[PDB]
Amino acid sequence: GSHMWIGVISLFPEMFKAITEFGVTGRAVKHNLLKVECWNPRDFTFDKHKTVDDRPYGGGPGMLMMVQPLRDAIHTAKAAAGEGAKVIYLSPQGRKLDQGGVTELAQNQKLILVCGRYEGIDERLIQTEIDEEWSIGDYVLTGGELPAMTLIDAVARFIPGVLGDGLLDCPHYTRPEVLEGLTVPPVLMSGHHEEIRKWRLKQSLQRTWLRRPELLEGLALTDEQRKLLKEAQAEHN
Amino acid sequence: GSHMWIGVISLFPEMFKAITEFGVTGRAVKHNLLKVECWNPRDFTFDKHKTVDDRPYGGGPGMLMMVQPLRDAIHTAKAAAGEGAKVIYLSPQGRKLDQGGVTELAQNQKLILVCGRYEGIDERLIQTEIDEEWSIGDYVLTGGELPAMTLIDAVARFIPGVLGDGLLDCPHYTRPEVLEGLTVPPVLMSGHHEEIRKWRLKQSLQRTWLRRPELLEGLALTDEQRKLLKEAQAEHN
Ligand SMILES: NC(=O)c1ccc(N[C@@H]2CC[C@H](c3ccccc3)C2)nc1
Ligand SMILES: NC(=O)c1ccc(N[C@@H]2CC[C@H](c3ccccc3)C2)nc1
């Protein structure tokens, strides 16, 4: 009942149809749990060719986004959002997004996401217009739209109504009972709900330990988790 | 001249228009540097309602993707790809993507990306059909399509013709010379190309040190980098 409004600044607003028209996020939008509203800097140009890029001072190969159309688009989104809208710029130089960061961001009722293109935006716009910079990971992309949609999808899951502990997930199985000689673990067939819970937890702990052992350091395990992990490490050994 | 073919398995192939129809990646597709071909498990169903999900053994709240339609779609993509196509499943349990991982993946001429929906896919399909699992970051999303497009965008940049050192990027500036009282650093106006190079490098080192100091540990700095970093740390202090 705590819907979310997300403003987006992008030279390619139609990309956002990927989240607004399909799947769980598509349903969230249709049901007004989530609203995504886009402004395109191109609509804020005044020259005949609607120029949205500009040359960097100091030379170099790439172009930056042109300040005036971009700035005007941001101001327009801010005016539509009213008070309390945090403005976010998606870039590799930003704070690294993780699930904890998602839950933090999901506390905001209003967000404005600025999507960079070309070699990015003028540093002074970050100083004057941007509240926080975030990265979805340590890699470089051709635009901030995919990171913006990634963020929107992640926070959308925390909006009550949208959906139906620091560890990786357990393996899951569905029909058929045998698949290419591979059988479903009997415990999952046993109907014994407490045995199944402990099995999945143990699998989560083992999988986390094997694939992402650094994740376990961030955790204070319950006595039960400590035990199951020890068991798994014993059996693995 | 070393184009890339990417097969995609997704219940929502139209999402991929976000990368195939717009921007740099849109141009790569139009110019046949990049080809993205989608198969939808829904087309591989046989029941009247084209069912693509199934119940997990052992109970629990969510659904998994139905094995038969998904498996059949993967086999079809593999047959179209011929030999040498690495099959990748995008999930939070996968290897964490970073720029080094992108460059590795960009070595492949052919990739098949399997996009999970609901609570994911049957573990045995990962054993039998998937070559590698990758994550775009430590957060949970409603589907693997955004991570798939993120990966495609990142590797696309390494395809020769698509575009026009372990450190964060330097600040960049474009017109106007003064923006809300904030001036462009004179060195960038000086025309002195060696001074500008050293300034940007120093800024990259300082920014990396301040925001992502762990990144510097992964590096063996040149004498010049060591010097500039020391200078920056001195001035900051
Ligand atoms: N990892 C991420 O979250 C992410 C990745 C790429 C990306 N590219 C955008 C287009 C240019 C601009 C840019 C590009 C490179 C360096 C600085 C700024 C930002 N944005 C966000
Ligand atoms: N961080 C990532 O790369 C990423 C994030 C989410 C995501 N969700 C997909 C839909 C369900 C399935 C799933 C979901 C949760 C746990 C396991 C499997 C995978 N996939 C990839």
Curated annotation (Swiss-Prot), chains A, B:
Residues making up the signal peptide according to the UniProt record: none
Places the protein is found: Cytoplasm
CDD domains referenced in this protein's UniProt entry, alphabetically: TrmD-like (cd18080)
InterPro entries xref list: Alpha/beta_knot_MTases, tRNA_m1G_MeTrfase_C_sf, tRNA_m1G_MeTrfase_TrmD, tRNA_m1G_MTases_N, tRNA_MeTrfase_TRMD/TRM10
Catalytic activity: guanosine(37) in tRNA + S-adenosyl-L-methionine = N(1)-methylguanosine(37) in tRNA + S-adenosyl-L-homocysteine + H(+)
GO molecular function: tRNA (guanine(37)-N1)-methyltransferase activity
Coiled-coil spans in chain: none
Predominant location: cytoplasm
Annotated residues for binding of S-adenosyl-L-methionine: 89, 116, 136-141
Functional summary from the UniProt entry: Specifically methylates guanosine-37 in various tRNAs.
Protein name: tRNA (guanine-N(1)-)-methyltransferase
Gene source species: Haemophilus influenzae (strain ATCC 51907 / DSM 11121 / KW20 / Rd)
Gene, per the UniProt record: trmD
